[PDB]
């Protein structure tokens, strides 16, 4: 099956909304959700970083299942930056779509993407679903 | 009674077709109609042929939606707004499930770009935005 890939940074109200939408897509299409979080994996990647990531993924998959979809955790430590990691993973598993959270920001004489969201949306070779 | 799928289309194009096909599939799965939108400002700068082309694009787009087995409606927006604000406000007004929009992906010089309308729709929207290449 071609999964829904959902990228989560941390546990947050936004992440929950992202996961709920991803679960709905998966339920409708009859495919599992692969929940991903990316770390580089060098000397800079600390114990607590990995702890938090594992907790986030465990929580995320529980949300997917509660919303009536099948979910799997995929921690990625592949020596890549997160956007490239997410995009490459999505291609590797032949994802139907990537689901990501975006910060809802009002304009301040300028209106900008976070570097991670920007690069996921633009570099992906799959549909990208952006949730606030 | 229903929360529609909103699809923003610029012109008749291969990209627009892919956008519409994805939107139709979302609509078929959810059992909701597709509202196809195109935005113009509507002052003296907006010429008659601009409006004609936009109406033709919407008519074409709805035919694609129906061919893909979904219910579609045309919604031309001439409301004195910039396209991104217009699309985002429309989606809120109709309580859309999601906005589906096309992304330009590459510039003539191979730069990774959204396209100015899609970029601002993605950032400004309150609704989920589905980005199709
Ligand atoms: Cl998030
Ligand atoms: Cl279901
Ligand atoms: Cl388009
Ligand atoms: Cl129809
Ligand atoms: Cl851009
Ligand atoms: Cl553009």
Numbering used by the authors:
A (entry chain B): 3 to 134
B (entry chain A): 2 to 134
What does the primary publication say about this deposited structure?
The structure of the apo form of AF0826, a euryarchaeal USP from A. fulgidus was refined to a final resolution of 1.97 Å. The monomer structure is very similar to the structure of previously described NE1028 USP. In all other known USP structures, the residues found between strands β4 and β5 region form a loop. In contrast, the apo-AF0826 and AF1760-AMP structures were determined to contain chloride ions, which are not located in the same place as the divalent ions, while AF1760 still contains the ligand molecule. The chloride ions present in both structures may come from the crystallization solution or cell and play some other role if any. AF0826 displays the same type 1 dimerization, the dimerization interface is formed by β5 and α4 from each monomer as it takes place is case of NE1028.
Universal stress proteins (USP) are widely spread proteins in nature. In stress conditions such as heat shock, nutrient starvation, the presence of oxidants, uncouplers, DNA-damaging agents, or other stress agents which may arrest cell growth, USP constitute a natural biological defense mechanism. Under stress, USPs are overproduced and through a variety of mechanisms aid the organism in surviving in such uncomfortable conditions. Here, we present the structures of both apo- and cofactor-bound forms of an euryarchaeal USP AF0826 from A. fulgidus and a bacterial USP NE1028 from N. europaea.
